[PDB]
Amino acid sequence: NVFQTRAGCLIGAEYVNNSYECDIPIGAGICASYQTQSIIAYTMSLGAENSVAYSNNSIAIPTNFT
Amino acid sequence: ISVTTEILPVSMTKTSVDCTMYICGDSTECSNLLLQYGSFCTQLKRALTGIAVEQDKNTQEVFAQVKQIYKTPPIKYFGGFNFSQILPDPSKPSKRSFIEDLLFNKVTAARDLICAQKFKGLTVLPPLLTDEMIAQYTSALLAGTITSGWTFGAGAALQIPFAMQMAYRFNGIGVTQNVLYENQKLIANQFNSAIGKIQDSLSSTASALGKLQDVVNHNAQALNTLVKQLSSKFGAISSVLNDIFSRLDPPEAEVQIDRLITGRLQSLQTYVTQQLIRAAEIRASANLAATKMSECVLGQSKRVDFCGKGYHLMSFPQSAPHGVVFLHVTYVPAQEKNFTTAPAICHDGKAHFPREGVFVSNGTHWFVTQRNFYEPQIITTDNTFVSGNCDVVIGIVNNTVYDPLQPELDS
Amino acid sequence: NTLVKQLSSKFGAISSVLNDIFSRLDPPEAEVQIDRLITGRLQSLQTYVTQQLIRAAEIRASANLAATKMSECVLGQSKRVDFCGKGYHLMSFPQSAPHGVVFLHVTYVPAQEKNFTTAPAICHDGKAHFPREGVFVSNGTHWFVTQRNFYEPQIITTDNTFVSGNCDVVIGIVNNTVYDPLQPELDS
């Protein structure tokens, strides 16, 4: 296959629409890995997505330690 | 309440050099002759690759410090503080803020210089992280510090109202919470005015980003001198080698070629050494920036003149071309007044020392007050402790102490 | 290894060894080849020394950082964030390794959080009450005071609260009762 990235042209890798942690950095936010029996090039995932409940009169207090 | 700006460089520009094109151009005879000098280019490639990976390591260490990406809730009330200029703006396609846009715009037929340098074997590689990812990291850090506080730097993010967070920080610097709870509106107005002044200064002044511009200028000057070195004879007949080959016989052409090769190799060596030194300095700056990010943004620092000039309250990060910008919010006293003091109070033949504050007098009476704010109170046994008689301490004075129990005995 | 391998270069001379150069050419002419070889080898060795100096400087910086970490994290307790580990620092231990040190950091991390409703101050008898070293919480029916980093509810009293001003200036104040521990024993 052929793929056009801002770092050039990539031949031999198939582009997928998922996102994983980077294994081999190619550049411009594009990384590559060996998975599935094949080589897949993907876009980096910064991390999990979270939201915090904020209001005038709410607090969170821990009840245990490690 | 004061807001101060700090600028720190983080990374550099990644470069790659092609030996054969730079030295021998498009001549095959020089290409054949070059092999005699051994392995002089594998070392150069290794050094440049090391610098290139070092830059990405620097950026990743500085910015990637949060495991989860947070978002601010749609409601934008934070106790009167605006924050609308430093939070992401969804309208623009870059998902950036006003100050970030100003900072990026601040630092900047015919053929472009980049193409001309590329056509001689000097190329620039792209960084691993785009600007959007750095913006997302900055937004996540801002959301975490606004909503959770410093709890997200040591575990899970626990929500807390902004006013109570400010009260905790005031307690940290050494002032009680009632000051904030009674001057919330004034503090919010001061913060908004300071942010507006920062806006005006950024929009007007164009010389506050010197360090990143100096980095860019140094890189440009190094490339310029490397390119200019190609047009010097080094003691030969001419710089152009085809004329040397055509004009005169091989016996002296070999000497001329050797002179040119030695000169160009020496120039490349000098360039690599200067690049190594500059990269070391940039890495030191990046380490300092990472430490500052971990100490001033994810917590409160007691160190003096580290996270701002004054008493530190908190800080905010923003991105910049090849660098980071810190907005420090700090506390400074004003409108001071003179008073008369004593070290202890001798009452009932016993010495009395304050528990937290200091003793003051306004001319006739005596009070106890906190250190960083004028708030007098009557000297009682609840805010005083006794140790020994009053004939040893130098400078003790006479007064009376109030006991909150005897009034209740008779009433 | 690369310094050793550089010895096979010719640097434009007729051979990579000296004895054959001295055993094939007259003294008037061998000088140019000897000069070329000597200059090349000197340049290689100088480059090696310079790179060694730069690497030594970096190692010195790392050693200074390790010394500071040993001074603060091990011999004492550090309040710096993310310096002696992730979390709240408790203590640390050193161990040795070939050309390096290994630090084991023992730290404290909260877990098992729970939601609560809070107010900044309590209005009682026309006066505002603030916590001393805690925070006000409520479980939907009653009110308590608890420490920040652990759950330990307690009854609001005079001993753990202080008063300043009226209760018509603080935003978010609520009405409740503050228990006086002097009258009940006085009236008994």
DSSP for B130-167, please give it: -HHHHHHHHHHHHHHHHHT-SGGGSSS-----HHHHHH
Chain B residue numbers touching A58 (CB-CB < 8 A): 159, 161
Residues present in chain B in total: 411
- Option in B38, B156, B299 nearest C81 (CB): B299
B249: tokens are 């016989």
Chain A residue numbers touching C146 (CB-CB < 8 A): 61
Deposited resolution, Å: 3.1
> What is the rounded CA–CA span in Å between residue B23 and residue B266?
11
C140: tokens are 């939907």
Name the minimum distance, in Å, from the CA of B132 to any CA of chain A. Answer: 10
Beta strands (DSSP E) in B10-61 are: 15-17
User: Could you tell me whether strands A38-43 and A14-15 are parallel, antiparallel, or unpaired per DSSP bridges?
Assistant: parallel
Q: Is B14 left (phi over 0), alpha (psi -120 to 50) or beta?
A: beta
Rounded to 5 degrees, φ, ψ at C118 are: -135, 160
> What is the rounded CA–CA span in Å between residue B209 and residue B204?
13
Chain C residue numbers touching A63 (CB-CB < 8 A): 111-114, 150-151
Structural contact between residues C145 and C134, judged by C-beta atoms closer than 8 angstroms: yes
CA torsion, ordered C107, A61, B303, A66, to nearest 10 deg: 0
> What is the rounded CA–CA span in Å between residue C9 and residue B37?
6
Tell which of B68, B71, B87 to mutate to test the A interface (max A CBs under 10 Å): B68
CA torsion, ordered B312, B317, B320, B322, to nearest 10 deg: 90
Identify residue C10 by its one-letter amino acid code: K
Closest CA to B211 of B308, B90, B106: B106
Name the minimum distance, in Å, from the CA of A62 to any CA of chain C. Answer: 4
B82: tokens are 């605006």
How close are the terminal C-alpha atoms of chain C, in Å? 93
> What is the rounded CA–CA span in Å between residue B175 and residue B373?
7
Sequence-ordered list of residues with C-beta below 8 angstroms from that of A42, at least 6 positions apart, any chain: A15, A16, A18, A19, A20, A30, A31, A32, A33
User: B69 and A46: CB-CB below 8 Å?
Assistant: yes
Sequence-ordered list of residues with C-beta below 8 angstroms from that of B199, at least 6 positions apart, any chain: B85, B98, B99
CA dihedral (B290, B296, B302, B307) positive or negative = positive
Chain A residue numbers touching B67 (CB-CB < 8 A): 47-48
Nearest-Cα residue of chain B relative to residue A54: B159
> What is the rounded CA–CA span in Å between residue B167 and residue B163?
6
Beta strands (DSSP E) in B246-322 are: 311-320
Structural contact between residues C186 and C180, judged by C-beta atoms closer than 8 angstroms: no
What is the SS3 assignment for B289?
Answer: helix
How close are the terminal C-alpha atoms of chain B, in Å? 47
- Option in A57, A59, A63 nearest C112 (CB): A63
Q: Is B265 left (phi over 0), alpha (psi -120 to 50) or beta?
A: alpha
C12/B contact by beta carbon, under 8 A: yes
Sequence-ordered list of residues with C-beta below 8 angstroms from that of B162, at least 6 positions apart, any chain: B78, B79, B81, B146
> What is the rounded CA–CA span in Å between residue A57 and residue C133?
19
CB atoms inside a 10 Å sphere around CB B169? 21
CA torsion, ordered A34, A35, A41, A43, to nearest 10 deg: -120
Residue B209: C-alpha distances to residues B8, B105, B110, B142, B321 (Å): 9, 11, 30, 22, 10
Residues present in chain C in total: 188
Rounded to 5 degrees, φ, ψ at C58 are: -65, -40
Rounded to 5 degrees, φ, ψ at C182 are: -105, -40
Identify residue C29 by its one-letter amino acid code: E
User: B159 and A56: CB-CB below 8 Å?
Assistant: no
Chain B residue numbers touching A56 (CB-CB < 8 A): 161
Q: Read out DSSP for B188-226?
A: HHHHHHHHHHHHHHHHH---S-HHHHHHHHHHHHHHHHH
Chain B residue numbers touching C80 (CB-CB < 8 A): 295, 301
Closest CA to B245 of B6, B25, B45: B25
Rounded to 5 degrees, φ, ψ at C119 are: -140, 150
Helix axes B42-63, B250-292, angle to 10 degrees: 10
Structural contact between residues B30 and B354, judged by C-beta atoms closer than 8 angstroms: no
What is the SS3 assignment for A15?
Answer: strand
Closest CA to B86 of B145, B8, B142: B142
Structural contact between residues B323 and B9, judged by C-beta atoms closer than 8 angstroms: yes
How close are the terminal C-alpha atoms of chain A, in Å? 50
Name the minimum distance, in Å, from the CA of A42 to any CA of chain B. Answer: 13
Contacts 24+ apart (CB under 8 A), B193-199: B194/B1, B194/B2, B194/B3, B194/B329, B195/B3, B195/B82, B195/B85, B195/B86, B197/B3, B198/B3, B198/B5, B198/B99, B198/B327, B199/B85, B199/B98, B199/B99
Task: List C residues 118-137 in contact with B (Cβ-Cβ < 8 A).
Answer: 118, 120-121, 128, 130, 135
Chain B residue numbers touching C9 (CB-CB < 8 A): 36-38
Chain A residue numbers touching B157 (CB-CB < 8 A): 50, 52
- Option in B69, B75, B128 nearest A50 (CB): B69
CA torsion, ordered A34, A38, A39, A45, to nearest 10 deg: -60
Closest CA to B12 of B54, B72, B63, B68: B54
User: A65 and C110: CB-CB below 8 Å?
Assistant: yes
Name the minimum distance, in Å, from the CA of C23 to any CA of chain B. Answer: 22
Contacts 24+ apart (CB under 8 A), C78-82: C79/B302, C80/B295, C80/B301, C81/B150, C81/B153, C81/B154, C81/B294, C81/B295, C81/B298, C81/B299, C82/B153, C82/B294, C82/B295, C82/B298
Name the minimum distance, in Å, from the CA of A60 to any CA of chain B. Answer: 5
Q: SS3 letters for C92-145?
A: EEEEEECCEEEEEEEEECEEEEEEEECCCCEEECCEEEEECCCEEEECCCCEEE
> What is the rounded CA–CA span in Å between residue B248 and residue B198?
68
User: C110 and B155: CB-CB below 8 Å?
Assistant: yes
Task: List A residues 31-60 in contact with C (Cβ-Cβ < 8 A).
Answer: 56-60
Interface size between B and C, measured as CB pairs under 8 A: 81
Strand partners, C123: C128, C175
Tokens 């971990």 correspond to what residue? Answer: B294
Closest CA to C16 of C49, C44, C41: C41
Nearest-Cα residue of chain C relative to residue A53: C115
